[PDB]
Design a protein around this ligand. Structure first.
Ligand code: HEM
Ligand code: HEM
Ligand code: HEM
Ligand code: HEM
Lengths: 146, 141, 146, 141
């Protein structure tokens, strides 16, 4: 994907300070809370009945860490998101049956978490660079759907 | 909101559908699966092959529901109550998909009702499907 | 734009049966009727007071011919839509200020029109091919927005 | 719909915005114009540069409308009647844009109210902005 030098540096710089374990858990937990329909993919995760239950669920935090970790990998290959995510794209379609619209929801929830965690440092221009990145990632993940 | 003329248009167009409601419902689903493959993510348990009984059966349940809503166009919320709970608590279909099915139902109706599918009826049907979609996704959160 | 040879043929073949002027007027009139917000760009066109006034407005009809003529020429360049529509993309953004969402609405109204026009010949597979094309064109027209 | 806890959450959060509501409204618009460039198509007559007084002025009007909505959370349609008319009959902003502004407002709140922006509050605010959005586009057609 296409990022200006300014956008790439804003992206890269912020990510250097993100604890993936921590943000990953928060991002997935908030998704399940704000968009409860998404719980349809995690029936075996335990108790997701309340925000507190969702947020302290170890299975949620574990999964959260896995997802953002794969997300961190694509950040290293911004020039070829589609090639980077082809295998997971096919997995998510063929085995998991996840509607790609959910990739977009997660992308928006992640932006919210970054703004929450970073405050004032997450400026309008920084957000803009991240918005382009999560849409890119969402597109790369839906690419092999059929 | 559906104006009084909207309700008259829907009732008139749906009336013509009549007995083909179930075959139209199956066609609209087939059009959706082909045009918008991501919608298949919700039917991994189905034989989605052309003319499968599973699709014909589902298509008929979908049309019946539509028939109930036209019949109770003044009180959809109460009429689709049960359907609204199932979609909100079990199925949990992302709302985007309702807009794709609605589009395929309009295309189907267009392909089958040359005489009745005027600009005004088209507008009324679009609004009606949007209303149904809103009622069905209303208890999500 | 990636279409199988089968899909391209389905597109080409039906198109050969279209009265561009007629379908153009119908599609633009129907957009204006079904999605009234779109009238925001056409206040100088005169009377758009009712479905009949819209469908019968000579300015609406002329604009539809113009829009579908361009669309039509684009069907000759399925392999280079971005290239084919780059200048129009710029115009629509910089001078016309048209939210690209409207290209998507028109594309769906166009498919409904073709269905109405062709009846049974507008099969599920023919619709799917046209769906890809209308999305392709919408994307190409939104490409230069900034 | 907005449950009693939702209403409680919104009033709490909004309460804390307090006097900064206008500054947050401007920040939200700026976020929107940078993140979703297509939204700029509705303000061809504005200076959209960082610090623009037009944006700041517009931000205060938006924020003031939201304050009015929170105050009348139980009777939004009537409170926002004039604004629904305006958007439906004059401005005619595609409904998709409301989702983009709503997202940017959430981002702004997150960035300014760390303590208050809990997952529960986040969910209630999202539902509230969707409700305002719905009211604002309810008379389009
Ligand atoms: C940021 C976008 C995402 C990325 C990069 C991503 C990545 C991954 C990865 C790396 C795995 C592990 C594969 C394995 O070894 O089994 C996985 C599994 C999974 N993902 Fe995604 N994911 C994303 C978004 C989503 C979303 C939005 C959902 C649904 C809301 C979802 C649902 C699942 C499920 C259900 C599994 C299987 C978990 C299990 O084994 O129970 N993913 N994902
Ligand atoms: C106009 C909108 C819709 C209507 C009126 C509708 C109606 C129905 C009805 C009547 C049923 C059967 C309930 C029963 O057997 O008791 C059903 C089930 C179902 N619907 Fe919805 N539906 C709509 C939209 C959608 C959409 C957009 C999707 C996904 C793309 C969807 C996915 C499903 C699924 C997966 C089932 C269960 C299928 C089965 O296992 O039999 N529906 N719907
Ligand atoms: C397939 C999608 C479309 C195509 C191919 C297209 C093409 C064109 C063309 C060829 C022109 C004339 C350019 C010129 O003056 O040199 C034009 C102008 C224009 N278009 Fe688009 N258009 C599309 C969609 C839309 C939509 C959906 C709207 C608004 C809802 C719109 C609004 C306008 C306006 C207002 C003008 C200027 C008319 C005038 O000055 O008489 N267009 N478009
Ligand atoms: C929560 C959602 C929104 C609220 C509460 C809101 C509220 C308002 C208010 C209070 C005004 C000023 C009316 C007056 O002049 O008295 C206004 C005008 C306007 N709004 Fe909305 N608005 C919302 C969403 C949007 C969106 C999403 C857009 C487009 C991206 C938009 C575009 C405009 C425009 C272009 C004006 C006129 C500005 C001018 O020329 O001064 N609005 N809105």
């Amino acid at each position: 994907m296409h990022l200006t030098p300014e956008e790439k540096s804003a992206v890269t710089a912020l990510w250097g300070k993100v604890n993936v374990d921590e943000v990953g858990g928060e991002a997935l937990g908030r998704l399940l809370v704000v968009y409860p329909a998404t719980q349809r993919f995690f029936e075996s995760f335990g108790d997701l009945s309340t925000p507190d239950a969702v947020m302290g669920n170890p299975k949620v935090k574990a999964h959260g860490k896995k997802v953002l970790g794969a997300f961190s990998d694509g950040l290293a290959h911004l020039d070829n998101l589609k090639g980077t995510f082809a295998t997971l794209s096919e997995l998510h379609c063929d085995k998991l049956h996840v509607d790609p619209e959910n990739f977009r929801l997660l992308g928006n929830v992640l932006v919210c978490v970054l703004a929450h965690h970073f405050g004032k440092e997450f400026t309008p221009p920084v957000q803009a660079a991240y918005q382009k990145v999560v849409a890119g990632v969402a597109n790369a993940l839906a690419h092999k759907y059929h | 909101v559906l104006s009084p003329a909207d309700k008259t248009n829907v009732k008139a167009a749906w009336g013509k559908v009549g007995a083909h409601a179930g075959e139209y419902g199956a066609e609209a689903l087939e059009r959706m699966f082909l045009s918008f493959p991501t919608t298949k993510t919700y039917f991994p348990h189905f034989d989605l092959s052309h003319g499968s009984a599973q699709v014909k059966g589902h298509g008929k349940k979908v049309a019946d529901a539509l028939t109930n809503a036209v019949a109770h166009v003044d009180d959809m919320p109460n009429a689709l109550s049960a359907l609204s709970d199932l979609h909100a608590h079990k199925l949990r279909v992302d709302p985007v998909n309702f807009k794709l099915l609605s589009h395929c139902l309009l295309v189907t109706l267009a392909a089958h009702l040359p005489a009745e599918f005027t600009p005004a009826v088209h507008a009324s049907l679009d609004k009606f499907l949007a209303s149904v979609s809103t009622v069905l996704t209303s208890k999500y959160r």
